[PDB]
From a paper:
Here, we have discovered an exosite on the SOCS2-SH2 domain that, when occupied by a peptide (F3), reciprocally enhances the affinity of the SH2 domain for its canonical phosphorylated ligands. Crystals of a 1:1:1:1 complex (F3:SOCS2:EloB:EloC) were obtained and data processed to 3.1 Å. Residues 4–14 of the peptide were visible and the buried surface area of F3 when in contact with SOCS2 is 400Å2 (PISA36). The side chains of Ala33, Leu36, Ala37, Leu40 from the ESS helix and Leu81, Leu82, and Tyr99 from the SH2 domain, form a cradle to complement the hydrophobic face of the F3 helix, consisting of F3 residues Leu7, Met8, and Trp11. Although electron density for the full Lys10 side chain is not visible, the most favorable rotamer for lysine would position the terminal amine at an ideal distance to interact with the cluster of backbone carbonyls formed from residues His77 and Tyr80 and both side chain and carbonyl of Ser75. Although F3 binding efficiently enhances SOCS2-SH2 domain affinity for pTyr ligands, our structure shows that F3 does not directly contact residues involved in binding phosphotyrosine or residues within the hydrophobic +3 binding pocket. F3 binding caused a significant (~10-fold) reduction in the rate of dissociation (koff: 0.245 ± 0.003 to 0.0235 ± 0.001 sec−1 with F3). Given that the crystal structures in the presence and absence of F3 (within the limits of available resolution) are essentially indistinguishable, but F3 binding significantly decreases the off-rate of bound phosphopeptide, the most likely explanation is that F3 stabilizes the conformation of the BC loop in its bound form and hinders dissociation events.
Suppressor of cytokine signaling (SOCS)2 protein is a key negative regulator of the growth hormone (GH) and Janus kinase (JAK)-Signal Transducers and Activators of Transcription (STAT) signaling cascade. The central SOCS2-Src homology 2 (SH2) domain is characteristic of the SOCS family proteins and is an important module that facilitates recognition of targets bearing phosphorylated tyrosine (pTyr) residues. The SOCS-SH2 domain conforms to the canonical SH2 domain structural fold and is distinguished by an additional α-helix N-terminal to the domain, designated the extended SH2 subdomain (ESS). The SOCS box, a conserved 40-residue motif at the C-terminus of the SH2 domain, forms two alpha-helices and is constitutively associated with the adaptor proteins Elongin B and Elongin C, which function to both stabilize the SH2 domain and recruit an E3 ubiquitin ligase complex consisting of Cullin5 and RING-box protein (Rbx).
Numbering used by the authors:
A (entry chain D): 4 to 14
B (entry chain A): 31 to 112, 115 to 136, 149 to 198
C (entry chain C): 17 to 45, 58 to 84, 87 to 112
D (entry chain B): 2 to 104
The structure:
């Protein structure tokens, strides 16, 4: 789930 | 190791078979409206500050509980909940509460599958309920490695 | 329409071809002899085929497996790729 | 729907049918698979012979009791020559002893 990886990396 | 742990957690979560991804709050409530008490799923959270949400049927209807991820640890929403246990693995968190209502806190029972799990995975689930000593089982190394990949009972 | 799957002990299980194609092994290869899968396992495999086809109203029910066959069932599932 | 296992000797047929269908229609299914006419078949629930005209519901095959994952067993006997053979079903193999760790 790369979308969730990037969401956490953003926040 | 913070990002590495979240990556491992998301691999497990994809392996659960009860992750519903971009399911909306309304879609989750509609899916659980008539489900039995304890029926649960995990989906993405629509809130900027949170990654994931547990949707669960309570005796008062479907409800949503967000999951925090901070300092490399997963825990239930601390705004709603307050000796809150922390976990490296979010599937572990779910498993913990699932076992906790097989004794006596959060009442989670049966997951809502997106589709039918593989037979291999159901066998793995069954074996995990019986022992943690996978290495002591009369099985070939390839199947022990497969068991090692998912040690949870749900 | 139907296929026959024969267990190591010679029990013959007749199941819908559509259901049987749940196994990638069977799909790749109207009788099939497994010689290494006993009937108490092959029967439950066939029940899995039925269960998987009927629930693929996603209110998928539980598929119960007795602890006494679980290890063998796992091996069979791994052999069948299902 | 009702999900059935029709069992005779070392043969087991996995099939489904409506709760509202009759014994005769199931014999017609058996005839299509095993190549024996209805009047040469007897079907049983335990020791109880099932009448061609009764519906499955009246015989005790309910959607709660005969699920995909746990089909109900229907026994089958053929008419060898004049009479009928005795209802015989060979049991499935026995599982080995559980490992200790599975306690």
């Amino acid at each position: 789930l790369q979308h969730l990886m990037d969401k956490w990396m953003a926040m | 190791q913070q990002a590495a742990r979240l990556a491992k957690a998301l691999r497990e979560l994809g392996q659960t078979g009860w992750y519903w991804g971009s399911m909306t709050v309304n879609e989750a409530k509609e899916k659980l409206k008539e489900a039995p008490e304890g029926t649960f799923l995990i989906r993405d959270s629509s809130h900027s500050d949170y990654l994931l949400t547990i949707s669960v049927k309570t005796s008062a209807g479907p409800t949503n509980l967000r999951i925090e991820y901070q300092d490399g640890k997963f825990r239930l929403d601390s705004i709603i909940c307050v000796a809150l246990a922390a976990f490296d693995s979010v599937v572990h968190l779910i498993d913990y509460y699932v076992q906790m209502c097989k004794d006596k806190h959060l009442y989670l029972t049966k997951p809502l599958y997106t589709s039918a799990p593989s037979l291999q995975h159901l066998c793995r689930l069954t074996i995990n309920k019986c022992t943690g000593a996978i290495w002591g089982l009369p099985l070939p190394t390839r199947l022990k490695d497969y068991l090692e990949e998912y040690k949870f009972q749900v | 329409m139907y296929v026959k799957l024969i267990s190591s002990d010679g029990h013959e299980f007749i199941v819908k071809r559509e259901h049987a194609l749940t196994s990638g092994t069977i799909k790749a290869m109207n009788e099939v002899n497994f010689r290494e899968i006993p009937s108490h396992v092959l029967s439950k495999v066939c029940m899995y085929f039925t269960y998987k086809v009927r629930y693929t109203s996603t209110e998928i029910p539980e598929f119960p497996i007795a602890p006494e066959i679980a290890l063998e069932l796992l091996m069979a599932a791994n052999f069948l790729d299902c | 729907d009702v999900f059935l296992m029709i069992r005779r000797h070392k043969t087991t047929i996995f099939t489904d049918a409506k709760e509202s269908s009759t014994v005769f229609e199931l014999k017609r299914i058996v005839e299509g698979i095993l190549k024996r006419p209805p009047d040469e078949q007897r079907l049983y629930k335990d020791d109880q012979l099932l009448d061609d005209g009764k519906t499955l519901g009246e015989c005790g095959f309910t959607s709660q009791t005969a699920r995909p994952q746990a089909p109900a067993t229907v026994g089958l006997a053929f008419r060898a020559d004049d009479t009928f053979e005795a209802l015989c079903i060979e049991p499935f193999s026995s599982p080995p002893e559980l490992p200790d760790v599975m306690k």
